Amino acid sequence: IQDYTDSEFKHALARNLRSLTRGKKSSKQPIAILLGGQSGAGKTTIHRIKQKEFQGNIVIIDGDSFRSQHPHYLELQQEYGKDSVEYTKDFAGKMVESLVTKLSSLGYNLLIEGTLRTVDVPKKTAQLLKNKGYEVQLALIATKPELSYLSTLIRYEELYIINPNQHHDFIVNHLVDNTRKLEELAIFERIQIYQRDRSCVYDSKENTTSAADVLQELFFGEWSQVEKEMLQVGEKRLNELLEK
Amino acid sequence: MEIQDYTDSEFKHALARNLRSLTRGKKSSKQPIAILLGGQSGAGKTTIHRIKQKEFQGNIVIIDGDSFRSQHPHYLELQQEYGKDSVEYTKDFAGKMVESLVTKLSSLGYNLLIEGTLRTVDVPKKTAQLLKNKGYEVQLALIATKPELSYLSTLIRYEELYIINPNQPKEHHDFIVNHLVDNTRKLEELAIFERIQIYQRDRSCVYDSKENTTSAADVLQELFFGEWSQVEKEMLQVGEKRLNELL
Amino acid sequence: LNPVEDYELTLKIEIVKERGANLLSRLYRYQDSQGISIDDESNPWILMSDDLSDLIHTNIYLVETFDEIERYSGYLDGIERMLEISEKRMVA
Amino acid sequence: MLNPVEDYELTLKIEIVKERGANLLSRLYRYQDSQGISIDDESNPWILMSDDLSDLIHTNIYLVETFDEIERYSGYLDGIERMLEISEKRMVA
């Protein structure tokens, strides 16, 4: 079926702790950063900023990558063509649980891909992170919802090139709402919003205006010179993938 | 017991794993071709390696004499004892590996791209005449470019190889121009190779003996002593610039 | 580098990360099916998983040029070629 | 596709890249020798590397026709090199 024995979790978990610890050093002053934002906005940008910003010394935990590590992935792919996800996130999530727990005890710097479409998951996470003595921050990525929906389609036309046998975008309203509430409930020491060109457009340390409001003008504002440019590039590259 | 005196077992162990490597990915025939190389060291021998590996669709065996010097069973000790002069202690092994690999591979029926020693008339004479004797179509693939442009690439390469390993000139090579012309004409007069092709740095073929009726050597001299193209004239400007970079 | 170049890089970084993670999971698949202990650093398969792991988890994010990407790509290419030959000797 | 000037540039890069690989191979041989791994032990993972690498040096590299394929290649060599470094040090530990 899709079961996993307990020695298999400890196996892949022990491996992952060896994996992620590599070349990283602990901190008496550790930092945890949660990631929000539409799926195809390019959160991979924030990775670049915060990896360089911590000069290699931050552990990134991306729940999604841990899917293939299900002891019977091959079997579940050789049936559920794409609907293998709900049989894998049972495993993947607890993998994140154990990783955040252990590494937060050992005081590493952590960057966590967050389910910001829901209010609770992150809240309950940063709470258990601050107890351990973590400066816990929020790092949001924002572009025009369209370009976001676009990159997800670009991605899906490249996810079909690899193996024919292999989203979280429509969230703009949940995303803004959950930001204001996490701001008011004062869960994060620092809140930051980033744009595709790695620019920091909002920093709660410097700025005083609401993080949620800055988001709305970023989503529902008029298109920037560069944004319209990105829109054509997508129409370009999708068409090639329309016949590649 | 010298620092470069290798055991027979040591030499054979290498011969074994080379014969394995070089065979891997190749089929042989009762219709095999062997192509000998000619032309100044800095001319661009790698151009022909490209032409012929494509032309043979992966089924030719390039034999590079210097590839095996670093296989000497004491190579390292020789490197940290003679720096660049390890060469003069290493050709003994390296050459013996080439003579070996041709011998065995010619008998096995594989297509071969070999360096010729066109600086001497005797070596390729003997080589081709022994390859003929095993049902081989023997050939001369010459790479010709303006002597200056050759000396220049040797001088850039030298300064490059000094930068990779600070413990690894063109007079040290050769100035073969008269020899390479004379000997080509001599090997044509003796009509030893089935084909003679002359190639240029842009992979163009500027002479083929089976399609052309001029002399291989006559075509050489035009290329060596003719007027310069802008493509030649330009490579000279890039060389002065690239050299300034390396120094 | 401008905003579009910079993002197109971020996209290549992404493509590579995914592609890498795919191979690492396959490496783990292979390593288990051989009984190779995780920290058996002497084993060439452990080295590959370890190197690649260090890149996916850190180094790709630190890449600044399109050339570095092509290098990492042909490196993955190298891994895959070796991994494919080992699974076909296996289900042989 | 490419200028005569660029085409020779590619030749030079292919020559550069071949020479490196050749030296990595020799190095990789020397290590396999110290480990008593037999010439043809295809079962041994280290032999796969030396098989893979020598296949490109002897054949595949000469069929390169883009500059980005040159990078593809040298990034491979880098990986091979990193693992050699670690293996050689592990002998001296």
Side-chain angles (χ1 to χ4, degrees), chain A residues 37-43 62 64-65 67 81-83 85-86 89 113-118 145-160 166-172 174, chain C residues 11 14 18:
Chain A
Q38 275 194 313
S39 178
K43 264 133 90 212
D62 172 64
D64 292 341
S65 65
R67 274 189 164 84
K82 27 229 259 286
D83 289 37
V85 150
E86 271 76 56
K89 200 68 183 185
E113 307 249 35
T115 327
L116 224 100
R117 48 173 187 97
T118 350
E146 179 72 8
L147 304 169
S148 200
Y149 307 140
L150 194 56
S151 331
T152 324
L153 290 185
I154 296 288
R155 182 53 55 208
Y156 170 66
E157 291 307 319
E158 285 159 8
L159 262 146
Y160 184 48
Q166 278 177 357
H167 259 271
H168 292 279
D169 266 311
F170 297 86
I171 265 150
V172 182
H174 283 342
Chain C
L11 272 177
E14 199 174 73
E18 310 258 357

Side-chain angles (χ1 to χ4, degrees), chain A residues 11 15 18-20 22 24 44-45 47-48 51-52 60 68-69 73 151 155 196 198 226 229, chain C residues 3-4 6-7 9-10 14-15 17 25 28-29 32 39 41 50 53-54 57-58 61 63-64:
Chain A
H11 177 67
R15 179 150 57 184
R18 200 187 162 273
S19 263
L20 300 160
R22 310 262 297 196
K24 319 276 190 186
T44 36
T45 282
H47 297 334
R48 300 190 61 217
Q51 201 62 60
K52 194 132 78 77
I60 288 170
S68 338
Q69 301 189 14
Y73 188 72
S151 331
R155 182 53 55 208
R196 281 182 176 186
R198 306 177 312 170
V226 187
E229 151 101 39
Chain C
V4 189
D6 206 47
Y7 183 64
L9 178 61
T10 308
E14 199 174 73
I15 295 153
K17 169 175 72 190
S25 272
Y28 293 154
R29 251 172 284 275
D32 291 2
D39 56 341
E41 300 188 56
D50 289 359
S53 164
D54 293 7
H57 299 315
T58 299
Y61 313 122
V63 164
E64 297 283 282

Side-chain angles (χ1 to χ4, degrees), chain B residues 36-237:
Chain B
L36 307 199
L37 276 205
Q40 304 172 289
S41 43
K45 57 152 177 63
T46 331
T47 292
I48 305 177
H49 293 350
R50 285 177 64 189
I51 287 159
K52 291 300 175 175
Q53 198 66 83
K54 187 160 144 205
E55 199 170 298
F56 276 80
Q57 290 172 317
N59 207 356
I60 197 161
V61 175
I62 315 304
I63 297 170
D64 224 36
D66 309 295
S67 287
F68 314 121
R69 322 188 84 139
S70 33
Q71 264 155 219
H72 183 108
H74 295 258
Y75 179 77
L76 291 185
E77 298 70 74
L78 284 172
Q79 184 125 114
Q80 209 206 357
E81 201 79 346
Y82 298 106
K84 303 191 306 289
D85 299 322
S86 64
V87 164
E88 229 209 43
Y89 297 80
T90 215
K91 34 80 173 172
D92 201 17
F93 178 106
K96 201 186 189 178
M97 187 65 50
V98 177
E99 338 279 277
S100 265
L101 285 164
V102 188
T103 296
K104 187 83 208 77
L105 289 166
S106 48
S107 293
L108 258 144
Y110 293 95
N111 293 313
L112 304 155
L113 183 50
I114 301 158
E115 321 283 297
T117 314
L118 298 234
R119 10 197 289 193
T120 326
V121 213
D122 319 303
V123 175
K125 255 188 76 191
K126 181 189 139 67
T127 301
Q129 285 197 222
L130 280 163
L131 291 151
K132 283 267 283 194
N133 291 4
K134 297 177 182 192
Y136 272 73
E137 182 167 344
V138 202
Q139 296 181 342
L140 190 69
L142 298 166
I143 179 88
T145 35
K146 284 286 179 211
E148 174 81 355
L149 285 184
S150 177
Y151 308 143
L152 185 46
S153 292
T154 291
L155 285 184
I156 290 157
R157 144 79 64 262
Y158 168 81
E159 279 289 353
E160 285 173 338
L161 278 189
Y162 165 72
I163 282 179
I164 306 172
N165 180 8
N167 264 116
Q168 208 175 18
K170 184 62 185 198
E171 86 223 289
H172 287 216
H173 273 280
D174 42 47
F175 276 52
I176 330 169
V177 174
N178 288 306
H179 278 68
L180 178 73
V181 168
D182 293 353
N183 298 357
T184 303
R185 211 187 282 99
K186 287 292 154 191
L187 297 168
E188 196 150 54
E189 173 154 21
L190 297 176
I192 313 177
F193 310 104
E194 171 59 40
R195 205 180 202 88
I196 308 183
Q197 301 176 325
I198 296 162
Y199 289 100
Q200 284 181 160
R201 279 178 172 184
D202 54 357
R203 285 176 297 112
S204 317
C205 184
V206 191
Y207 170 89
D208 177 327
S209 65
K210 212 183 85 184
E211 327 301 318
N212 306 140
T213 58
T214 359
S215 339
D218 273 11
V219 185
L220 289 188
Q221 288 168 301
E222 276 166 27
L223 305 171
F224 283 177
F225 302 102
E227 185 180 349
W228 284 58
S229 67
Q230 264 83 336
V231 208
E232 285 166 328
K233 234 163 295 215
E234 266 167 63
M235 272 185 281
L236 200 64
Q237 321 194 49

Side-chain angles (χ1 to χ4, degrees), chain B residues 13 17 26 46 50 70 157, chain D residues 11 15 30 33 55 59:
Chain B
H13 172 79
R17 70 142 86 90
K26 275 95 207 222
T46 331
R50 285 177 64 189
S70 33
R157 144 79 64 262
Chain D
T11 300
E15 200 188 44
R30 282 191 298 278
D33 284 343
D55 283 13
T59 304

Side-chain angles (χ1 to χ4, degrees), chain A residues 30-36 43 46-47 49-54 57-62 100 108-116 122 125-126 129 134-141 188-194:
Chain A
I31 289 165
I33 313 165
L34 307 191
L35 295 170
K43 264 133 90 212
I46 305 186
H47 297 334
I49 302 148
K50 295 298 176 189
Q51 201 62 60
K52 194 132 78 77
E53 203 163 319
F54 282 78
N57 180 43
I58 182 157
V59 172
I60 288 170
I61 297 157
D62 172 64
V100 172
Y108 278 111
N109 293 139
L110 308 172
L111 179 54
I112 300 141
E113 307 249 35
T115 327
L116 224 100
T125 307
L129 270 159
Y134 271 81
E135 187 197 345
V136 206
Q137 304 164 330
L138 181 69
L140 301 157
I141 171 78
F188 304 93
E189 330 274 10
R190 205 168 154 168
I191 304 152
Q192 292 190 329
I193 300 161
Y194 290 103

Side-chain angles (χ1 to χ4, degrees), chain B residues 13 16-18 20-22 24-26 42-47 49-50 53-54 58 60 62 64 67 70-72 75-76 153 157 160-161 164 168 201-203 231 234-235 238, chain D residues 4-5 7-12 14-16 18-19 22-23 25-27 29-30 32-33 37 39-42 47-48 50-52 54-55 57-65:
Chain B
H13 172 79
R17 70 142 86 90
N18 291 132
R20 187 186 163 266
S21 267
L22 296 159
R24 179 183 215 69
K26 275 95 207 222
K45 57 152 177 63
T46 331
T47 292
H49 293 350
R50 285 177 64 189
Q53 198 66 83
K54 187 160 144 205
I60 197 161
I62 315 304
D64 224 36
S67 287
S70 33
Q71 264 155 219
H72 183 108
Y75 179 77
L76 291 185
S153 292
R157 144 79 64 262
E160 285 173 338
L161 278 189
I164 306 172
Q168 208 175 18
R201 279 178 172 184
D202 54 357
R203 285 176 297 112
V231 208
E234 266 167 63
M235 272 185 281
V238 188
Chain D
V5 146
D7 197 40
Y8 185 60
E9 277 282 34
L10 187 77
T11 300
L12 298 149
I14 289 157
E15 200 188 44
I16 288 293
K18 189 217 175 162
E19 282 189 22
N23 285 323
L25 192 69
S26 271
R27 191 186 178 175
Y29 285 166
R30 282 191 298 278
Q32 287 161 6
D33 284 343
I37 304 171
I39 288 145
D40 66 333
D41 197 339
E42 274 150 70
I47 292 294
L48 279 189
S50 41
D51 286 351
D52 202 38
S54 50
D55 283 13
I57 299 313
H58 301 334
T59 304
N60 283 37
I61 199 145
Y62 301 124
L63 316 171
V64 161
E65 275 175 18

